[PDB]
Every structure is written in C-alpha cells, then in structure tokens.
From Swiss-Prot:
EC code(s) of this entry: 3.4.23.22
Keyword terms, alphabetized: Aspartyl protease, Disulfide bond, Hydrolase, Protease, Signal, Zymogen
Protein name (database record): Endothiapepsin
Residue ranges annotated for the Peptidase A1 domain, each copy included: 17-328
Enzyme class: hydrolase
Keyword Membrane in record: no
Taxonomic lineage of the native organism: Eukaryota, Fungi, Dikarya, Ascomycota, Pezizomycotina
Organism (species): Cryphonectria parasitica (Chestnut blight fungus)
Record-stated family: Belongs to the peptidase A1 family.
Catalytic activity line of the entry: Hydrolysis of proteins with specificity similar to that of pepsin A, prefers hydrophobic residues at P1 and P1', but does not cleave 14-Ala-|-Leu-15 in the B chain of insulin or Z-Glu-Tyr. Clots milk
Amino acid sequence: STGSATTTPIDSLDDAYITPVQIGTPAQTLNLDFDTGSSDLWVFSSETTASEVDGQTIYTPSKSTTAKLLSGATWSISYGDGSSSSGDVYTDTVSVGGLTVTGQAVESAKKVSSSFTEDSTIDGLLGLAFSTLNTVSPTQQKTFFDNAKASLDSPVFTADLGYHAPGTYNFGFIDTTAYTGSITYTAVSTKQGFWEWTSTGYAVGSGTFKSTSIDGIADTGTTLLYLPATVVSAYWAQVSGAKSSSSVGGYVFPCSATLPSFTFGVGSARIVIPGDYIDFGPISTGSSSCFGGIQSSAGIGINIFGDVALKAAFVVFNGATTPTLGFASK
C-alpha cells in the first residue's frame, strides 16, 4: 500500500503545516501537524476541557462505530516550546492520503496548554519519530508509520514541505518526480528516539564551506533551524544590523535586509536554504525588526533541522531495519 497527502502552511510565515487525517467511521477529518520529532497521535476531542477549545475541529469517539476505549491508558506530553497536552486513549481507524491503519492509538486530549488553544488551525499532532518516545502508559503505543510499515510497498515516508506553498507527505514510495539530482542517504541514530543524523558542515551565502560535524534531528514539527551558537553567529554576522535580542528571544535583523542563503552538508552533498526562507517577518505587527529563521540551539541540548531546513529539500525517512535519512535538492 501507499498513501499521499497534501500538507498546507497554517499561515503566511510557514509557522507549521497541517495535513488532513481521517479518523473513525464514518470519517472525521482533522487537520494534524505531522511531527517527526514526537511519537504521539493526539487530537482535540469531545473530552477536551471546553474553555481550552477555540475553533479546532474535534474528534468525537462516541460517533465512531470503530472507536474503542483503550482501558486504563493515559498520555501526557511536553514539547520543546513549553507546550503540553494530556488525556486518555482510544483505538480507531486512521487514514492518511488513502493509507489506512486499523487499531491506531488516537490519544484524546482532556487538557491542552494555551499555545494549542490559541492556534485554531491545528486539531492535533501526528508523531512520526520512533515509537520508543510514545507517552502512553502503562502500555506504550506505536506511531501511525510503525503500524503502517509492514503493509507499505517500501518502509519509508517522505516530507516535501513547501515555501509559502503546499507540499506533500508520501508513505510507502519515493516520488522520483519530486526532486532534482540524486538522494544522498546518511546514517541515523535512534538512541534518543529521533531521526538524529550528522550534517557534514555549512556555508553562509557564497562563502566557503566549513567541514564540521553537526549532530541534530530532522524535525518537521519545529519551525526554525536551531544550530550551534558559533554557526548561527557566523550567519548573522553577514547581515548588517542583525543582533541577538534577549528581550525578543533570539536573533533579529532589519526588515530592510536581503538575507544570505545558508548551505548545510549531507555527506558530500549540499542543501541550499535561500535567504528568503530565513525571514520570519516583523517581531510584532508593524515593527521594522524581523525575526530570524536560524537560531542558536544553546540551552535546548540538541540541534534541530526544523522546517526552515527541511523545506529546502525532499527528505526521505527510511524506516528499514537500519533507519537512514535521505536528502535531495528540489
């Protein structure tokens, strides 16, 4: 089997992407944030505290003929941005882009933190990291990918995120029309439950490439590119008037600037992030200070190749017995 679904930016900045997901019988379609940095499929639901729901579409298990309470199971998750959610668990039929899994754990939120409530466009998350990170207790549950894997034509999914445009998540096949040149594959460590890999270095603009190992994670659920402070300082030093602002919480730059590109290495290959991808617009409405898309990972404890980086590539998440990542230009 295969599946193919379009993923759509939630706003004009590409702060996140949503993908429609069918849950239950008859189908209830929710728009989920596919997150290769976590391993829980959780939804706004009929159980969510009413004051914490503001415009989201909810899953109502009582209206699904295939929903079953997973008795005694609970979940609770905290993300890198400080957000959180928790609740109880159903199993139900879940389809993505025509690919169906029966018996998928659908984590129903009883509580969500304010950032979730305030984002009306995201109805929940679909985690695509390794199932070792799944938070269900006392019986850990599998991701949608892990449950689909054995049925897929190939044990892979791909992320093809757009810049200010829709893109695609495919399951079970590699669309050879969706990228240019060849795909470079690189090793993955699953020791922390992430798609963790090592970039071979970077360049700023037209500058020379710096060969240096940068360990980090491929994380579709993180907006920005978080890299070591040395690398980030070297990038922003090329932008007149850029500075790190402790009050704003990262590097800002004059909205009048033209940003340089940023290149990262994948083995001997290179992915170029155009400068425009690094502009996250005014820090507050009408400001002439703009927020940067490359930020320091210092204090986060891991480097994160978030959407800023991944949207410059066609990315293969290879879930074979030994997982690997692949990157191609597009």
